[PDB]
Amino acid sequence: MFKQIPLGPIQTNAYVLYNDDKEAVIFDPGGDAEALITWLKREQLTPLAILLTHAHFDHIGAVDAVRDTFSIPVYLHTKERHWLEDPALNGSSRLTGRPITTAKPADHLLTNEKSLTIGTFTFSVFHTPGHSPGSVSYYYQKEAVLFSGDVLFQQSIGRTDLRGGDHTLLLASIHNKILPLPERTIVASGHGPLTTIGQEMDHNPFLTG
Ligand SMILES: [Zn+2]
Ligand SMILES: [Zn+2]
């Protein structure tokens, strides 16, 4: 009940989660806005919200166009609230030499909520910093999928060398908050192929402790 959609030159994975009523939740629309918008329209899906795992430039480049086209709210953790509009904070200037920004701040700011309901989609919310200070992971129990951004990938873990990066915090997020989830849970991460909690527990070389 979701699609992984790599977008932009970085090929960061956006996700569209949907239901049988053709309503949808968008995660991390990072680039190539027109490819994402036209796909949603071809599929006759009605998006309800944009949920951001974090505000690095490669996850936000299509936010303006998607937000404007569909008149939907943007959710982001308060610790990164300044990052959307500031290219000196979100990595674009430093990592690519060009500024990437939104034109408006997020209209919903997350803090310590453990649950979030978007229409009839309910998520458990975990604050999972280490790759970035406002990184959050959205667990959708109904279809056993975790939209965890750049914390945990297939065969690797998030880089901890960017603004506010902290490897000691990232490993705690992984061991204490992500890996206790059910082993069949799909890890729908920001970069690379899908995986599951169980597969990474057994085979991710950065997770032998
Ligand atoms: Zn990132
Ligand atoms: Zn990323």
Numbering used by the authors: 1 to 209
Quote the paper.
Previously, BLEG-1 (formerly termed Bleg1_2437 and Bleg1_2478) from Bacillus lehensis G1 was identified as a member of the metallo-hydrolase-like MBL-fold superfamily which exhibited enzymatic activity and predicted structural characteristics similar to the B3 subclass metallo-β-lactamase (MBL) antibiotics-degrading enzyme (E.C. 3.5.2.6).
The crystal structure of BLEG-1 solved at 1.44 Å resolution unveiled structural features which may have contributed to its promiscuity and evolutionary divergence. Diffraction of BLEG-1 single protein crystal showed that it has a space group of P41212 with one molecule in each asymmetric unit, completeness of 98% and Rmerge of 0.045. Solved 3D structure of BLEG-1 showed a global topology of an αβ/βα sandwich fold, with the active binuclear center located at the interface of N and C-terminal domain. At the binuclear center, both zinc ions are coordinated via trigonal bipyramidal geometry in which Zn1 is coordinated by His-54, His-56, and His-131 residues, while Zn2 is coordinated by Asp-58, His-59, and His-191 residues. The zinc ions are separated by a distance of 3.3 Å and are bridged by Asp-150 residue and a water molecule, Wat1. Another water molecule, Wat2, is interacting with Zn2 at the apical or axial position. Analyses on the global structure of BLEG-1, L1 B3 MBL, YcbL and GloB GLXIIs revealed that the enzyme showed higher resemblance to GLXII, particularly to YcbL, a GLXII-2. Yet, the active site architecture of BLEG-1 resembled that of L1 B3 MBL, which allowed the accommodation of β-lactam other than SLG. The insertion of active-site loop in the N-terminal domain of BLEG-1 active site formed a configuration similar to B3 MBL binding cavity which eventually allowed the accommodation of β-lactams. We propose that BLEG-1 could possibly have evolved from GLXII and adopted MBL activity through this insertion.
